[PDB]
Write the structure tokens for this entry.
Amino acid sequence: HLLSLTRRAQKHRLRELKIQVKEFADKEEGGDVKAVCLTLFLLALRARNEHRQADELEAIMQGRGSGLQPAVCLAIRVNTFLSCSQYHKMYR
DNA sequence: CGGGTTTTTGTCTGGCTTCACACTTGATTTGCATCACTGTGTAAGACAGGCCAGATCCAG
């Protein structure tokens, strides 16, 4: 079952398709394999109605800091009736 | 009871990455320990004793 083996074998299996994608990228974008594969996988996720994972992927492709400032954490801790102990529990 | 037919993979091989890898040291940020209290335990039932009430016996 593919997507479960290790490397150097799944390659040997998908070598034909990989060289075809390489030819297509060379013909279209001259070798921009990374971007075209990213777009193909994003649309493949969107086809199966998996917007959450696709959004997470397109957000991490930037690699960004999704950290909340302490004001927002304080607002959440106050306006939701949370004791400091339970908030610390959730935090850890 | 073991001859063929496909996966499943470290390998050779040297030349290239993005990553990895040694003292400071003063603040700076986490992470953990410490201390005085806490809330849930939350209505009835069995029994002895005193008390009159009306019944229990006694008298000429």
Q: What stands out?
A: Residues 5-9, 12-13, 92 of chain A lie near DNA strand B (CB under 10 Å from a C1'). Chain A is about 65% helix and 0% strand. Residues 10-28 of chain A form the longest helix (19 residues).
